[model samples]
Target chain A: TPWSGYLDDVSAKFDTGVDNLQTQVTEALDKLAAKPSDPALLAAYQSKLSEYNLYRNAQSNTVKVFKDIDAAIIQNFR
Target chain B: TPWSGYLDDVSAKFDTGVDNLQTQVTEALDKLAAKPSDPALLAAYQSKLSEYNLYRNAQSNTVKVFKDIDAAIIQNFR
Candidate 1:
């Protein structure tokens, strides 16, 4: 019960947070595209894009592991 | 500048957090596989596994969007 509530909250929070982050980053990417020749803008874009990539890699790994876990649970328990 | 630092911190935090979550879930799944018959255990496993799936879905989507954003940024800026 306690775990369910906590997990539910985490799921909802991250779900919404990541969606919003994606939209924000997409807009930032578009802005950078408009001024692709400016060094300052390019550096800023690279910095933001790299950090977001790291975060995305982490999430991607997590999702992969979770999917495996779900499959294992279903295979063995259900 | 401000955004870079904040983004860096977010990247680091989530990077570590998601890796830990993956390890934790993998271990939990292994435990569930070892005991596949108990109803109470099955129920608990199902609950945790399903919640993790939801979380995973959220992260998966986030990664996909971020990857697209990264590609667009690179194509236009670099």
Candidate 2:
């Protein structure tokens, strides 16, 4: 496993995925800020936030596992 | 993460997922063996095999990731 191979391939995809998540979140947050009194905006923000939190937390665990097994073993020689 | 907590909760669920996958595979195998000449059986067997492989591989990765992060870090506390 080339250090650049998995890391480069995954980081691009992950960056896109994260950016997309943030854009949706940013839209929801801005709208919520603009209309703090709107129930729909509040719900939208909360929904986005919940999913963001789920992804963020789950991904941390996932990356750690990837580093432990794949990088620790495969990339050790390099 | 209590050793008895995350491990116990996930192990049973994983066992069930694995057993369910195997049962479909066994059914596919028996039927295909009974009707070795049938194209439908061949197709059915292939379909079942693909799904089984997907679940099996993805799950191995998932479990390794889970163990590395949750067990290595959280369950370290005794």
Candidate 3:
């Protein structure tokens, strides 16, 4: 069961996490491109970006572990 | 359609919803970028970000509801 695990939901969340961070960063960068002089805007945008990176790091290791387990199971089964 | 209906596509995928969350968040934060730092704006930005979190929690509930209903239907049909 660990092989299957909560594969569906976990994979869904992981995939979403990647896209969400990317969009947030890209949108912020676009805003910064227009107004490079505003410190508060820059700081706030950068903060959002930083938070996204931190959130990703928090869960990335778990995803790696799941991938590793998945690979091992397939290898053994085959 | 409720006040806010499903305007676009929905899938077993998660990317759309995640983007929905961040783009919505950034748009609010960007609104807070340059001003007298209005408390109302601050509250609005914070509200948007917090709503994003609440949406995720509610998503878990709705997804679980669907999962249970789906399992029952599949069992009956099978």
Candidate 4:
């Protein structure tokens, strides 16, 4: 499979996406934890998490995992 | 001094690290000073100030300065 057809550009894009998700998720969690009692704070965190999840979960022949996360706790916590 | 040179990338990276430290120190100080007379709060503030100072003092090519002067007043008051 030395000739496997994997585009370098796609691999780079995926790497960036994964890194972005790591930052977004970490920030979202930290924010939520910091302002657990504030409804406005919770909403803000939830919205960001949702926005990133949308980008993450999009099904592609190339990639599909981000959106499938159990959003239940995320929803409940929000 | 005509041929003076610098690494643009290293300078850029250093600039970012300093900016991040400034933000962290300022926020730590803000959080510490926000609850004035509380012993717990004062302790927290002093601890962060101490920790930040330790890292900040050891610099040559990178210098550190207070971006959070307001926080210092809490200690001055106490």
Candidate 5:
């Protein structure tokens, strides 16, 4: 049986993608801080934060699952 | 109007959280490559990939929206 390279590829993609996403998000947040009291802008900013949080939590679980599986495999390896 | 610090706080949390998640995921995938043909393992990996992709795409959009908003504000600043 051949070990397909798909998992490794996807893993790399996610590694790069997620990092870029976080950097941009932080940059925006930093800039937003300068105008924190602009009611309309703040509302829009809060809404995005709420939406981002949902995805962030879900992504965390995904990573946790991978870590668990990897640990199990390493245990099996010995 | 006072700029509440909520956005900055959440941003910092997410920045830290997402990077940690990616690191774990990549580590898992690297280990997983050694046993690529294991049906159970491959299935589990694929499912997680599916789930993670959804969140990843959503997170990308979230970042884009923030960038757009931030850009608009910067335009206003000039």
Candidate 6:
């Protein structure tokens, strides 16, 4: 019950992380497209790509956290 | 400290949801672009757009869930 009740808050954070980061990637890609050969721009775009990868993966790991909570609760009860 | 963890599993589900659904939208757009006037394709593309909207919004909401978790813990103690 304690774990189930907090799912909404978790959801809100995930949404913010995804939307903001995805937009960063989108804009970087758009800018890169505009000037496909400038080294500085390419580097900037690359960072955004990897940054999203990190955030995406990190944010996704939240799932395991919730599952583990449930498992721990059930384990402790028994 | 009781609820300061278990964030990974929540992430895994969000990743699965975003990647798979975003791909659906990408492919749908690509297909629709190839045949711009096909009514069936248009309808399918429209649906994908709305579907992504729903998922994107829902996925983003996961943020609030985590925030609430933290807030609830602190509030309950006091």
TM-score for each model: 0.39, 0.41, 0.36, 0.30, 0.37, 0.41
Residue-level error in angstroms, candidate 4, position B4: 39
Residue A41 CA error for candidate 1 (Å)? 0.7
Cα displacement (angstroms), candidate 3, residue B8, comes to 27
A best-first ranking of the candidates according to their TM-score comes to 2, 6, 1, 5, 3, 4
For candidate 2 chain A, which ten residues in a row score worst on lDDT? A29-38
Off by over 4 Å in 2: A1-78, B1-5, B14-19, B71-78
Chain A of candidate 4 compared with the true chain A, TM-score: 0.47
Residues A1-78 of candidate 6 have per-residue lDDT tens digits of 545446556655766545465666787799899989754455455445544554545455565577678888999986
lDDT of 5 by residue, A1-78 (tens): 756464455455555665565665676677667756444655555655665676567666676787788889889977
**Worst lDDT 10-window in candidate 3 chain B:** B2-11
Candidate 6 chain A: 10-residue stretch with minimal lDDT: A50-59
Candidate 1 RMSD to the real structure: 25.6
Instruction: Between candidates 2 and 3, name the one with more favorable lDDT.
Output: 2
- Tell the DockQ for candidate 1: 0.03
Ranking by lDDT: 5, 2, 6, 1, 3, 4
True contacts kept of 5: 0.04
Per-residue CA lDDT of model 1 for A14-74, tens digit only, reads 5555545665567768888898865335444554666666555555554556667777888
List CA RMSD, all candidates: 25.6, 17.6, 14.2, 19.9, 33.7, 15.7
**Which pairs of residues collide in candidate 1?**
none
Candidate with maximal lDDT? 5
Cα lDDT tens digits, model 4, A1-78, are 445333444445754544455565677688789768653344344434543443333323233222234344467776
Deviation of model 5 at B21, angstroms = 3.5
Q: lDDT (0-100) at residue B38 of candidate 5?
A: 83
- Give lDDT tens digits, candidate 1, residues B1-78: 123344445434444566555555667678778888888777777776786666555544454565677556544421
Lowest lDDT 10-residue stretch of candidate 3 chain A? A39-48
Chain A, candidate 5, TM-score of 0.52
Taking the tens digit of each residue's C-alpha lDDT, what string does model 4 give over B1-78? 111112222323443565565566678678766767888777776776676565433421231112123224323332
Predicted structure 6: lDDT: 0.61
Better of 3 and 5 by TM-score: 5
Q: Per-residue lDDT tens digits of candidate 3, residues B1-78? A: 211111111111333456565576777787788763899888888888788667555544454454455445434421
